[PDB]
Design a protein around this ligand. Structure first.
Ligand code: SF4
Ligand code: SF4
Ligand code: FES
Ligand code: FES
Ligand SMILES: [Fe+2]
Ligand SMILES: [Fe+2]
Ligand SMILES: [Fe+3]
Ligand SMILES: [Fe+3]
Ligand SMILES: [Fe+3]
Ligand SMILES: [Fe+3]
Ligand SMILES: [Fe+3]
Ligand SMILES: [Fe+3]
Ligand SMILES: [Fe+3]
Ligand SMILES: [Fe+3]
Ligand SMILES: [Fe+3]
Ligand SMILES: [Fe+3]
Ligand SMILES: [S]
Ligand SMILES: [S]
Ligand SMILES: [S]
Ligand SMILES: [S]
Lengths: 633, 633
């Protein structure tokens, strides 16, 4: 089982699933091998009913699509559609939060409110919305209106791009025509240009993809901004992760998906129903997180994280998961059938994301509290049905310090330099105590033993004094393996990094260091890393493609991760991807994305499936940036 | 060669291509066989980097996707993405016309203007825009603003749906949640819900697809409305079709693609440059049409149609095509390489639709006349380069009467009943002289001998007194085979239909009948058929699912054709498709789309690859509607 997952709690549940005859994601993968090499390499097109068209990577015919589409065109069109799909998910999440904020301040959804007034005002100022002499509800209405306006063409480009990157970066992107005109506008233009008989030049197609990736970045940044207004900006918090956070004697409720609009309410309502849970024979309601919705409530409320991504079915296999409350994205639909075997009540809540066989509850912000109570009462009923049934919860969990929003990181740094908070970080980059910064992002992927790339690369970088930040299921992997526990700083961290983590932590009262890796939140919260990196660029007076900052989607899976990796490149970062994207069937496309894009945006992909080698390549990229700034390395 | 195309001019060019060693679409198809059966049946998914996933139609594993996605989910998600891609193309075309109209009336593009003031005012009235006491330029600015607003969420749904279908039809659709909220909004929501780990219920997915198909209908209707304002509403016109419309002694310029924003200008400017062409040794500039842009200028100006769809390369093979001027959609990118062998200058004009190896001219409405002259001078230079080179233009052409906009059809009917123009048509439906109405739409497809399904089905329906209307490359096929020549009425038409076509034609001064088939224009102009059918529904006081009206995408290819067929079903029509869409891998999906959707919208797909059988099934559908109205059949 260690060939499937490096997480020992997951291995234990894989053994239980095996002896119980419950098919898992790893079994479904095995049943799919050998997978189609045309699709793997990107050399398949189904964009019209003359297809499917495939192209042999090497050899004889077929060499070209039926309509004349070359391998370069087919590869670029497929990649573009994946970027647009990722943009559609992150920006759909953001759009749903914009409507929630609007309803809240119009008096239509009293369960929601402006919780972070400071963030509201700072966002308004960044957008150019006047605040002097205005009521908060009116400022927030204007912010929500501006958020919705960025989805379509108007007299300004997408402000959640142009107002969040330094002017010099916007200028570079504008010169290449890469600034998006509207989020949904770009998604639709991708779908058009990639349809049959339209765009058929690889460079033109890929420039379109870069622009659509910035629409994804805008959706990410808008989602973080709106969730922080509504639910609070994260600050440091201590909690736990892995399956051992489930409790046999409690009602265990997983919140799973991405948009916390309802699960933030689940968290507060669950505390009100504790006596109702006790009357049912439980100790209380134990809300736990899966995937990004779990990250959201972990960052804001310290809700413990049960599991992530590829191993999500294993929470059910314990027998103790009474409910799994779903919104959208990254939910294996297998959960609906597995629930028949495990007793879990799987509940969907969003109209556009249903699963055959799950119970649907039509969540509405206007009825959020009542919807939550209905859902939690189903979970309570399920707990009662398992009275006397043995469960197998692996007694495996790690300590997690998280909550490192960009505001929290700046505030922590300010304890070392109150009026120039970024300077202590830059000082330590310059003197070599911090070699550079690496953001781990993205998913797990069944093709890679779970977490093996994240942990292998992270260990090498930390020993070489890299400041490591993480989001989404990259944060999930690292938290489950102890990388967010300050007690592991001595084992994991180079001496220089250890010294910095210790100085900051002690200056913040912790009596110990910051953790080895800083959790910056959910996948939309990759935008927080952008805010941090853009703030460093501004403080130094250089563009992002001169900073010693890299990204790694070390185990990527979702179309969203493709979009994120693409915008990381577009804003100027060397960006590693540790699974093969469907590009290798076209050398010209691969060369653009890994080499000639450097001349456009200064960023570039690093495709490397071997994690030791990937770590070496990421260090080389960091060190090349250091040398370009005249620094030792 | 008759196994490839039933068009004799195409067969002649296929022989020339063969002996010259020029690879064609049919050769590329042969080189692709056998095609992948997983893709053919819809049982392939590449929506995440754990894929590709495939499912065996029958037999053993794989039976399910790696994430747990069933065959029903995979099939429905793929189909939804095709609908969204089609919507993105038609609505991108409409959006581009909306911006053109806005620029025209703001004084920013003097080559464009309000040409159809009556249509402008009628559209404004239908949208609720006041006209009394307003300048035309202000009414048109409001119409353009309303068009752009339908792309995003606002306080009203998509008006180019809700204002163009009868209230009873809107009510049915609203009750099922099918009215789109915004065109690009729905496209993006499709992309989100179909991404990994989101919507996973076939019925829910397909309802989303139906709603997105109505966003496509809105884009189609908006495109027709705006093109009619800008360029004139079609009226009956006489011209010719097929390769014989090329002239060796002229500069032959094909306009190819879909959006006539520039090619309508090409048409007028070409007439100004006739002396410049004569100074180069030509008789003049002979503008000819390919595909839908050709349909647009045929309908409005009688520009002869050279060829369509699958056979587009054959125009080049003549050796006499001096330029091919491209916008977007349905252009085989092979044209760029074939041009090296044939001498044709292939020119792209739209930023999001380039082809490696073609010359790009950056068309801007503000510079439309100058851009046109630059393009036409390249064509003139190319004509000069072929002085003394033999060409082979098949001496094959048909007479084409076209221009049957819905306004033109109503006006023609009004000569038989001035104040109740639809009544003569309804009278003849009731007495059986007109059995019903069939719209032929969509593309050719290399899998089907070119035009064989269109002509086989049309012949059977016409003998059975069906009024046949046609658009896009369905109109193209029928025009190239003589179905738009009134001289063929006696051979093709049943006695009842002949009597009606003759009465209308003679009442309109023609001294002869209307043609056997009425050309209603380009693919967006399928919206004109909707206008006609909705007007008949309103006049009869019934919904569209009670009318004896059917549609046939007899040789469909493009994602756009999937979207059109889906909205035809959604508005209530029995809708034949004569190529296999990628649905047969899921019986539950197939049953929804061909049977249980009847209970939702009253329409339904009829999948039938054999054209004789398809004609029988379409007649049965028409006759079932007749019986439901109490009529003999
Ligand atoms: S768009 Fe071209 S390559 Fe793709 S399926 Fe259609 S014919 Fe084949
Ligand atoms: S979304 Fe599911 S079915 Fe599709 S490729 Fe990914 S794992 Fe396979
Ligand atoms: S041929 Fe396998 S992905 Fe299309
Ligand atoms: S396996 Fe052939 S289309 Fe994917
Ligand atoms: Fe996520
Ligand atoms: Fe077309
Ligand atoms: Fe996840
Ligand atoms: Fe995910
Ligand atoms: Fe992910
Ligand atoms: Fe994730
Ligand atoms: Fe993610
Ligand atoms: Fe066409
Ligand atoms: Fe077409
Ligand atoms: Fe077509
Ligand atoms: Fe066509
Ligand atoms: Fe078409
Ligand atoms: S995700
Ligand atoms: S992701
Ligand atoms: S088309
Ligand atoms: S089409």
């Amino acid at each position: 089982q260690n060939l499937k997952s490096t997480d020992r709690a997951v291995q234990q549940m894989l053994d239980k699933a095996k002896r119980e005859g419950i098919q898992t994601v790893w079994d479904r993968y095995e049943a799919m091998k050998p997978q189609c090499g045309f699709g793997e390499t990107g050399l398949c097109c189904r964009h019209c009913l003359q297809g499917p068209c495939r192209i042999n990577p090497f050899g004889d015919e077929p060499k070209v699509g039926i309509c004349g589409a070359t391998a370069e065109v087919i590869v670029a069109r497929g990649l573009d559609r994946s970027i647009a799909a990722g943009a559609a998910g992150h920006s759909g999440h953001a759009k749903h939060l914009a409507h929630t904020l609007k309803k809240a301040v119009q008096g239509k959804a009293a369960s929601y409110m402006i919780k972070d007034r400071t963030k509201l005002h700072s966002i308004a100022k960044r957008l150019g919305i006047p605040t002097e002499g205005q009521k908060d509800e009116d400022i927030a209405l204007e912010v929500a209106k501006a958020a919705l306006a960025d989805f379509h063409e108007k007299d300004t480009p997408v402000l959640w791009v142009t107002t969040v990157l330094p002017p010099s970066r916007v200028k570079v992107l504008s010169a290449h025509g890469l600034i998006p005109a509207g989020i949904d506008h770009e998604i639709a233009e991708i779908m058009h240009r990639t349809s049959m008989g339209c765009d058929a030049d690889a460079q033109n197609l890929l420039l379109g993809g870069l622009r659509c990736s910035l629409a994804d970045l805008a959706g990410c940044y808008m989602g973080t901004d709106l969730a922080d207004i509504l639910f609070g900006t994260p600050a440091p918090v201590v909690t736990e992760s892995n399956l051992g956070v489930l409790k046999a004697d409690a009602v265990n409720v997983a919140v799973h998906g991405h948009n916390p609009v309802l699960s933030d309410i689940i968290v507060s309502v669950s505390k009100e129903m504790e006596n109702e849970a006790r009357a049912a024979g439980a100790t209380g309601i134990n809300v736990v997180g899966i995937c990004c919705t779990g990250n959201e409530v972990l960052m804001r409320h310290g809700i413990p994280a049960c599991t992530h991504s590829v191993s999500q079915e294993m929470a059910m296999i314990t027998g103790a998961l009474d409910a799994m409350i779903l919104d959208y994205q990254c939910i294996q639909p297998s959960v609906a059938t597995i629930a028949e075997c495990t007793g879990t009540t799987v509940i969907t809540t969003m109209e556009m994301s249903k699963i055959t066989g799950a119970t649907h509850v039509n969540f509405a912000e206007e009825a959020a509290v009542e919807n939550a109570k209905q859902i939690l009462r189903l979970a309570i009923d399920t707990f009662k049905r398992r009275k006397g049934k043995p469960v197998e919860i692996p007694n495996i969990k790690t300590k997690v310090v998280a909550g490192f929003s960009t505001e929290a990181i700046i505030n922590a740094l300010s304890k070392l330099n109150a009026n120039d908070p970024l300077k202590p970080l830059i000082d330590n980059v310059v003197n070599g105590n911090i070699r550079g910064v690496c953001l781990f992002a993205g998913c797990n992927n069944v093709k890679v033993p779970q977490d093996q790339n994240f942990t292998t690369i992270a260990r090498k970088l930390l020993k070489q004094n890299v400041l490591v930040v993480a989001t989404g299921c990259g944060a999930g992997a690292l938290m489950r393996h102890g990388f967010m526990d300050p007690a592991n700083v001595d084992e994991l961290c180079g001496d220089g990094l250890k010294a910095v983590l210790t100085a900051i932590g002690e200056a913040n009262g912790l009596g110990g260091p910051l953790p080895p890796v800083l959790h910056m939140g959910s996948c939309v919260d990759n935008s927080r890393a952008v805010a941090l990196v853009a703030a460093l660029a501004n403080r130094l007076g250089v563009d992002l493609d001169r900073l010693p900052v890299v990204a790694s989607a070390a185990e990527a899976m979702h179309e969203k991760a493709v979009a994120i990796g693409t915008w990381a490149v577009t804003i100027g970062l060397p960006t590693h991807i540790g699974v093969l994207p469907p590009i290798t069937g076209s050398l010209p496309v691969t060369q653009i994305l890994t080499s000639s894009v450097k001349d456009i945006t200064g960023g570039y992909f690093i495709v490397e499936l071997d994690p030791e080698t990937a770590a070496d390549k990421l260090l080389a990229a960091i060190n090349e940036r250091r040398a370009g700034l005249g620094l030792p390395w």
